[PDB]
Amino acid sequence: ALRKPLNWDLETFQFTNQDGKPFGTKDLKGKVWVADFMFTNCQTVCPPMTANMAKLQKMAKEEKLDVQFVSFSVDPDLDKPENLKAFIQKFTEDTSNWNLLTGYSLEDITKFSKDNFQSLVDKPENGQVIHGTSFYLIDQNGKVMKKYSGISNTPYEDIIRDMKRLAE
Numbered sequence: 001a002l003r004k005p006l007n008w009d010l011e012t013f014q015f016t017n018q019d020g021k022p023f024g025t026k027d028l029k030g031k032v033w034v035a036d037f038m039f040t041n042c043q044t045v046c047p048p049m050t051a052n053m054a055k056l057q058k059m060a061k062e063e064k065l066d067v068q069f070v071s072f073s074v075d076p077d078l079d080k081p082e083n084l085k086a087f088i089q090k091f092t093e094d095t096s097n098w099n100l101l102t103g104y105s106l107e108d109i110t111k112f113s114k115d116n117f118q119s120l121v122d123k124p125e126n127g128q129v130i131h132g133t134s135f136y137l138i139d140q141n142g143k144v145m146k147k148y149s150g151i152s153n154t155p156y157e158d159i160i161r162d163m164k165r166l167a168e
Helices: 045-062 080-089 106-117 156-167
Strands: 014-016 022-024 035-039 068-072 098-101 135-139 146-147
Touching: 022 098, 022 135, 035 045, 035 106, 045 068, 045 156, 068 080, 068 106, 080 098, 135 156, 146 156
Parallel strands: 035 068, 068 098
Antiparallel strands: 014 022, 035 135, 135 146
16 A cells, blocks of 8 residues: 555646647546656756656556656746757657646746645746756646655655555
């Protein structure tokens, strides 16, 4: 069984993916998914985070786990769909189950990150947006259940275990 779940409520949302198509709760409700926050002009942790998410994607597929991946841009003023599409192509050849989202205001995503993921977003003068570095596991009921590091010793086996529990 899933131990010590977070049980965080998530608001209903509809954003735009890297193909310029609507995507959000409508698509995700009923699926197990993993979320992170990132931006394409990040000079530090976002590329390794994304590589880590790609490793998780590959491992989940190998285990025959049917899950979705979602990356929210925290720099929507710069990250349009074409930016996200070009960004993700470096890290994976599979986006059938990975949507990178944008299309909203910076204020919007700041509130969304605060209210749903208890994570501060703020864009300083140098443009290097402050945001959380966690991966979040969300269940079929649309609640956040687990948080893991996306950048430091990502616990791939723990995440896989938890996905297996949600699939049972």
